[PDB]
């Protein structure tokens, strides 16, 4: 599209789509939490004449609502989904997406911590993905685990086909020059981790955070910036 949408520009409840590249597109919606009102993105990928989805659009309503978006803007069927990490962000609308049919996936990582915490968890569980550095495929994307970052569990998502790089919440878009929340983050770890996404996506083009604006590779080194800066707080 042109302006990519923001906090002011969605009501709580509705849900954008943005195309990326051929095949590919963003899904954008907005949520109360703790009195202020956040944008989050995911991710949406044809997979043939079907479509594999990443990550919900936080709740129930807001999920049913991405469902209706993408009949409406694509008209293809979402058949699987992947959530990259444990909180409701990622997770809350789960049981929207398995009421209608779609096949939910995680790693065990993620479906336990899930459970702890009272978060809907995903059906299904992805193998492979328990060591910093495995990657896996899963159709028109390859699934990397980076290692601890913003939580233990995070993953990213890389699109071959279209040079395209989902950080999730483990990536900060540029106008986040301070820590948002750590409560659940591995800081010591976290350069290091970034790291691994860099040597392994060195042609990436595109960088997709998991809330606020698209970006380039710059995003890894930015978000390396804030988080050290965080570390050395007084
Ligand atoms: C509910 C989500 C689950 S990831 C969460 O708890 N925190 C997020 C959201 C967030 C905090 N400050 C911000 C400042 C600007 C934009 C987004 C944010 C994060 O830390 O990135
Ligand atoms: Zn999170
Ligand atoms: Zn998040
Ligand atoms: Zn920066």
Redo the contacts with the bound molecule.
């Keep these: 599209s042109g302006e990519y949408p923001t906090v002011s520009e969605i009501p709580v409840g509705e849900v954008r789509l943005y195309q990326i590249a051929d095949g590919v597109w963003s899904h954008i919606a907005t949520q109360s939490?703790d009195g202020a009102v956040?944008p989050s993105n995911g991710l949406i990928v044809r997979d043939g004449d079907e479509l594999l989805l990443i990550d919900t659009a936080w709740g129930a309503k807001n999920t049913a609502a991405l469902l209706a978006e993408i009949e409406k803007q694509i008209g293809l069927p979402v058949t699987r989904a992947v959530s990259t990490h444990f909180?409701?962000?990622r997770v809350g609308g789960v049981d929207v997406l398995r009421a209608a049919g779609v096949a939910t996936y995680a790693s065990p990582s993620t479906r336990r911590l899930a459970e702890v915490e009272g978060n809907e968890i995903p059906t299904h569980s992805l193998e492979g993905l328990s060591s910093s550095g495995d990657a896996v495929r899963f159709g028109p994307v390859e699934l990397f685990y980076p290692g601890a970052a913003h939580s233990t569990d995070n993953l990213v998502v890389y699109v071959p086909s279209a040079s395209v790089l989902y950080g999730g919440?483990a990536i900060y878009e540029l106008s986040?020059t301070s820590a948002?929340?750590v409560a659940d983050a591995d800081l010591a770890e976290w350069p290091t981790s970034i790291e691994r996404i860099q040597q392994h996506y060195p042609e990436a083009q595109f960088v997709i955070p998991?809330?606020?604006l698209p970006g380039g590779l710059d995003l890894l080194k930015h978000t390396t910036n804030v988080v050290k800066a965080h570390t050395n707080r007084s």
């Design positions: 939490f956040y909180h409701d962000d919440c986040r948002g929340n998991g809330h606020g």
